[PDB]
């Protein structure tokens, strides 16, 4: 019937592949029917099959990339596609740890002379 992604994620890879190829076969024969000239049912079903193929590929890719980043979750060097894709300037920006590093000179300066909380009577 109407295939949806909720029950596709639990499916294993080989079953998804052996469903994807059947979707490809059905799309191909629907294309053949369109070229020959048939009823509008096949023409309408062409869009449904294409979207179903797209949804299956999306699920397969999401599971594959999720497993990849799960594998690279704890490692130090990770592939560029798995790295966070923010703006170039933000990536080149210093991190919070480096920008929070404070030299001993200003550390002891803040120690000896902290900013006080004061008030003046009218």
């Amino acid at each position: 019937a109407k295939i949806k992604a909720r029950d596709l994620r639990g499916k294993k890879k080989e079953e998804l592949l052996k469903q994807l190829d059947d979707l490809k076969v059905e799309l191909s024969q629907l294309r053949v029917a369109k070229v020959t000239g048939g009823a509008a049912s096949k023409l309408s079903k062409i869009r449904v099959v294409r979207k179903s193929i797209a949804r299956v590929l999306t699920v397969i890719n999401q599971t594959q990339k999720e497993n990849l980043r799960k594998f690279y979750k704890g490692k130090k060097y990770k592939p560029l596609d798995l790295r966070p894709k923010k703006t170039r300037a933000m990536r080149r920006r210093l991190n919070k740890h480096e920008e929070s590093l404070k030299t001993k000179k200003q550390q002891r300066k803040e120690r000896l002379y902290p900013l006080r909380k004061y008030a003046v009577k009218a």
Binding site: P84, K86, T87
Partner: protein, 86 residues
């Protein structure tokens, strides 16, 4: 024979379509583009033709990635987070 008869020898084009700017100005003999300067790594751009500059700017074409960056900015470029499922 300066005019109409001279016009009859137009049979070998000088420029071809540039592979960077897309306009038909890529000089073959010069091997350079008169519209954007394809061999030069810097896009041809002069301030004495404001109309020419405006015809091809950042906001002219599709903005395939920049308009995505614009809508990501309003959320601060979130990464790795998804809305809570039902």
């Amino acid at each position: 024979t300066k005019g109409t008869s001279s016009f009859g020898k137009r049979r070998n084009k000088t420029h071809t379509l540039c592979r960077r700017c897309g306009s038909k100005a890529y000089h073959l003999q010069k091997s350079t583009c008169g519209k954007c300067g394809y061999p030069a790594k810097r896009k041809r751009k002069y301030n004495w033709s404001a109309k020419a500059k405006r015809r091809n700017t950042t906001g002219t074409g599709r903005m395939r990635h920049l308009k995505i960056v614009y809508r990501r900015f309003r959320h601060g470029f979130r990464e790795g987070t998804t809305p809570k499922p039902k």
